[PDB]
Amino acid sequence: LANGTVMSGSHWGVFTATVENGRATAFTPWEKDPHPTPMLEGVLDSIYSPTRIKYPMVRREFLEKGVNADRSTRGNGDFVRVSWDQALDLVAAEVKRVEETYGPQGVFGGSYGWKSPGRLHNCTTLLRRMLTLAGGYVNGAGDYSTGAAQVIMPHVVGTLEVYEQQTAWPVLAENTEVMVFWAADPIKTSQIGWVIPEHGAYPGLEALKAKGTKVIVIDPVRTKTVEFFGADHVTPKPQTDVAIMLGMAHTLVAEDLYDKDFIANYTSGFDKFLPYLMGETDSTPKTAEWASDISGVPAETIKELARLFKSKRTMLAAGWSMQRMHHGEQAHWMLVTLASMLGQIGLPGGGFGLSYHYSGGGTPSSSGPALSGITDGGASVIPVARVVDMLENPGAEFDFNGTRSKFPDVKMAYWVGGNPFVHHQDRNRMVKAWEKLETFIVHDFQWTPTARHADIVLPATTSYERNDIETIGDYSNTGILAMKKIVEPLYEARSDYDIFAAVAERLGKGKEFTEGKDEMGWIKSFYDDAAKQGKAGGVEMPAFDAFWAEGIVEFPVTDGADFVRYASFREDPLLNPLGTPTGLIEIYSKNIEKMGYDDCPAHPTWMEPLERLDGPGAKYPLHIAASHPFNRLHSQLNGTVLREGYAVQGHEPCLMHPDDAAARGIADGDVVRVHNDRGQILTGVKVTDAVMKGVIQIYEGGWYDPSDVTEAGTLDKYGDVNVLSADIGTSKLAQGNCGQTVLAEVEKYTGPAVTLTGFVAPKAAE
Ligand SMILES: NC1=NC(=O)C2=N[C@H]3C(S)=C(S)[C@@H](COP(=O)(O)OP(=O)(O)OC[C@H]4O[C@@H](n5cnc6c(=O)[nH]c(N)nc65)[C@H](O)[C@@H]4O)O[C@H]3NC2=N1
Numbered sequence: 001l002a003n004g005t006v007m008s009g010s011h012w013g014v015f016t017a018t019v020e021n022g023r024a025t026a027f028t029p030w031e032k033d034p035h036p037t038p039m040l041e042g043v044l045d046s047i048y049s050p051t052r053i054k055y056p057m058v059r060r061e062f063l064e065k066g067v068n069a070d071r072s073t074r075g076n077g078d079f080v081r082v083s084w085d086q087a088l089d090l091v092a093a094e095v096k097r098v099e100e101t102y103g104p105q106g107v108f109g110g111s112y113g114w115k116s117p118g119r120l121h122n123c124t125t126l127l128r129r130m131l132t133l134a135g136g137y138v139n140g141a142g143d144y145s146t147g148a149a150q151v152i153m154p155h156v157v158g159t160l161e162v163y164e165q166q167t168a169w170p171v172l173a174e175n176t177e178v179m180v181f182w183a184a185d186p187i188k189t190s191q192i193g194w195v196i197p198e199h200g201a202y203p204g205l206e207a208l209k210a211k212g213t214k215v216i217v218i219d220p221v222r223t224k225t226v227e228f229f230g231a232d233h234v235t236p237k238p239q240t241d242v243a244i245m246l247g248m249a250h251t252l253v254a255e256d257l258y259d260k261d262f263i264a265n266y267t268s269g270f271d272k273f274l275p276y277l278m279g280e281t282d283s284t285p286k287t288a289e290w291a292s293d294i295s296g297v298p299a300e301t302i303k304e305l306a307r308l309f310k311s312k313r314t315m316l317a318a319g320w321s322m323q324r325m326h327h328g329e330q331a332h333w334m335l336v337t338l339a340s341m342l343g344q345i346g347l348p349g350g351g352f353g354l355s356y357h358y359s360g361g362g363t364p365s366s367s368g369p370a371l372s373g374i375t376d377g378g379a380s381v382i383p384v385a386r387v388v389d390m391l392e393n394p395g396a397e398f399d400f401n402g403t404r405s406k407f408p409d410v411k412m413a414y415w416v417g418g419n420p421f422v423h424h425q426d427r428n429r430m431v432k433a434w435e436k437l438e439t440f441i442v443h444d445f446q447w448t449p450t451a452r453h454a455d456i457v458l459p460a461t462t463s464y465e466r467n468d469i470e471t472i473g474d475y476s477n478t479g480i481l482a483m484k485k486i487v488e489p490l491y492e493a494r495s496d497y498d499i500f501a502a503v504a505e506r507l508g509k510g511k512e513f514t515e516g517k518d519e520m521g522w523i524k525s526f527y528d529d530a531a532k533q534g535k536a537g538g539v540e541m542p543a544f545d546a547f548w549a550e551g552i553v554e555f556p557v558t559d560g561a562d563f564v565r566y567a568s569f570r571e572d573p574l575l576n577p578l579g580t581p582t583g584l585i586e587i588y589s590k591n592i593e594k595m596g597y598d599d600c601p602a603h604p605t606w607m608e609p610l611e612r613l614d615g616p617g618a619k620y621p622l623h624i625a626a627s628h629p630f631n632r633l634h635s636q637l638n639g640t641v642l643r644e645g646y647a648v649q650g651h652e653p654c655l656m657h658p659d660d661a662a663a664r665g666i667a668d669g670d671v672v673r674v675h676n677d678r679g680q681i682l683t684g685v686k687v688t689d690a691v692m693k694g695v696i697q698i699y700e701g702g703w704y705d706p707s708d709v710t711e712a713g714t715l716d717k718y719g720d721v722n723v724l725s726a727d728i729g730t731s732k733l734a735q736g737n738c739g740q741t742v743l744a745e746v747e748k749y750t751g752p753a754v755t756l757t758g759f760v761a762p763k764a765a766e
Pocket residue numbers: 145182183184185188189190191192218219220221223236237238239240241318319320321322357358625626627628629630631632633634740
């Protein structure tokens with residue numbers, strides 16, 4: 001057996017693995033990583049944990065009855081182990097049957113998911129490459145991260161904005177006087193990257209602290225971002241940020257402080273927005289006092305913040321939680337409007353930024369080339385979060401960005417690299433709608449709730465059991481890494497590439513799928529490509545084997561540290577207008593006006609959400625800050641040793657304010673039932689004043705562990721927050737998810753003891 005070290009990467013960073021007798025025994029972070037993630041050891045563990053999928057399995061009821069199977073029992077763990085050949089024969093037969101019987105509209109291939117990095121072993125693209133050869137499929141559009149923001153921004157500033165390079169960190173360090181983190185916790189969220197992360201946000205944050213720059217955080221939770229900076233902390237009732245922003249804008253107009261020149265020369269539609277702000281249209285001036293009545297933030301505080309932002313070089317760095325809510329489009333649209341009134345857009349250190357908390361935005365871009373990877377080669381596309389609406393309403397129409405389409409009639413769903421039975425909203429609704437599917441196939445290397453609900457489960461390998469290549473730095477393009485194989489594939493696990501190649505072979509399309517190339521053949525072609533472009537661009541790169549021997553190639557930064565977003569638009573709006581219909585920032589959109597959507601007006605507007613903390617006639621008393629986990633990447637790593645560090649009596653933790661806990665006779669460490677009209681879950685409480693009164697925090701990603709799959713509304717024993725969320729569109733414009741629009745009640749759990757079954761494999765899978 002092998003003994004030695006091997007370097008590779010992941011969504012958590014670059015690392016060196018120590019291998020002893022063919023087993024990985026430790027992951028040590030890259031010496032050049034400025035801030036490694038404590039989660040790295042959970043990544044190692046995920047390769048060997050009790051929930052690792054060993055063999056290909058088929059649900060017994062499905063094996064026995066096929067389409068006539070009782071579908072209500074999916075998830076009960078009654079699986080039968082089969083050989084790879086029979087499993088592959090079955091999958092290929094089912095794909096062909098559905099394609100022939102129902103056409104491409106019958107196969108849902110959106111397969112949303114974070115998967116693992118890698119240009120070759122991209123499971124979701126490989127799935128689609130195979131389905132394309134099979135006859136076609138229904139795809140998903142957008143994502144769960146910025147579903148609302150990515151649709152509204154192109155109407156306001158002309159581009160998606162959320163996934164674009166930010167004004168460089170060093171520019172902020174030298175110019176910014178006030179840094180505001182609005183609904184953003186960069187310390188927590190910068191641990192991860194879509195491609196390999198360089199953790200560039202930490203050096204930037206540390207430089208701001210060293211400078212003595214003033215930091216203000218607007219978040220209902222006193223996060224580590226607040227603590228690291230000793231920041232001025234404002235806590236609004238969740239879902240009221242728009243009211244606060246209107247109050248600030250009203251103040252700036254009232255005191256005649258706003259930048260009339262910026263407004264006049266760089267925006268369009270402020271004249272149509274002003275009457276609303278003044279209360280002419282509805283007899284309700286949007287004053288700081290009015291904002292206070294809604295948000296709970298003192299009127300004088302709202303006024304002082306506005307005056308401060310107006311007089312200092314201020315950067316508004318906003319997160320995405322506030323748009324993952326009902327009417328989410330309004331949040332960043334109003335933020336940009338407020339930013340316009342301040343008039344600092346395009347100035348070094350001023351304006352706004354929507355990606356400082358994500359994958360290193362702001363970290364200086366190098367002059368390196370882009371790496372390419374394998375490609376894939378009723379409406380045929382639906383907004384990702386409308387997946388259950390589609391299942392329930394085949395043939396019904398839906399609105400999206402000014403167009404109206406019909407839902408296709410789906411009979412099969414194939415999922416890889418994703419965990420919809422954890423990520424999607426309103427679990428109970430989803431569990432029932434899933435019965436409309438004749439066949440559900442899943443590939444994963446961990447027994448997630450999604451894998452447990454499959455008709456056919458195929459064991460995939462992790463990135464550590466294969467070779468790949470990937471970029472370091474979504475925005476910085478720091479370099480290219482050789483993701484070298486660390487250990488041999490465990491049990492009967494196979495790469496998604498091999499599995500799909502075998503299925504395609506059975507469809508008579510093996511050669512079309514593989515292109516006659518093997519793993520290393522594909523990898524070399526991607527590298528050689530980047531190398532051709534590199535040399536043409538003046539960047540020197542080694543030959544393939546030389547690159548592989550060293551394991552990494554880094555690129556030089558030329559002028560990337562000087563980047564200022566919107567500077568050219570500000571310098572000359574005549575030569576460099578924006579990509580909007582007017583060429584200016586659209587505070588009022590004529591196009592959106594023409595759409596006639598009741599839930600998405602033509603300018604930023606405060607609207608009552610479905611449910612909110614202290615809202616009129618609200619039924620439940622507490623808002624659940626269902627945000628991103630500190631110690632998991634969504635659901636990833638829940639089934640590893642890391643869980644021991646945060647579980648409370650074996651359950652997902654629930655942070656609760658001492659006043660809220662006392663009113664209920666709840667003590668620190670108690671197991672509590674969190675419930676509303678949609679569902680009920682058990683969590684373990686940690687009493688802390690970190691969360692504002694009226695708000696509890698239960699992160700998304702907990703592995704749903706239902707008591708009885710056949711019992712409607714069954715209790716989730718572990719703590720999947722999505723058992724409590726509603727499944728509705730942000731509005732007709734974007735149809736984004738509202739995963740953080742959640743109210744619930746909590747009571748100490750005194751019922752019978754439950755046994756956690758989510759972190760051990762199904763008995764038959766052992
Ligand atoms: N550690 C970690 N785990 C992850 O799962 C993870 N996922 C990655 C992905 S895909 C994304 S998309 C990003 C997520 O980035 P995003 O900004 O969406 O993050 P969240 O954690 O949902 O929310 C950030 C903050 O918003 C606060 N907040 C919630 N409700 C409100 C509100 O109504 N008003 C205000 N002002 N603040 C509010 C929360 O309390 C939280 O501190 O993180 C990325 N990074 C990640 N890191």
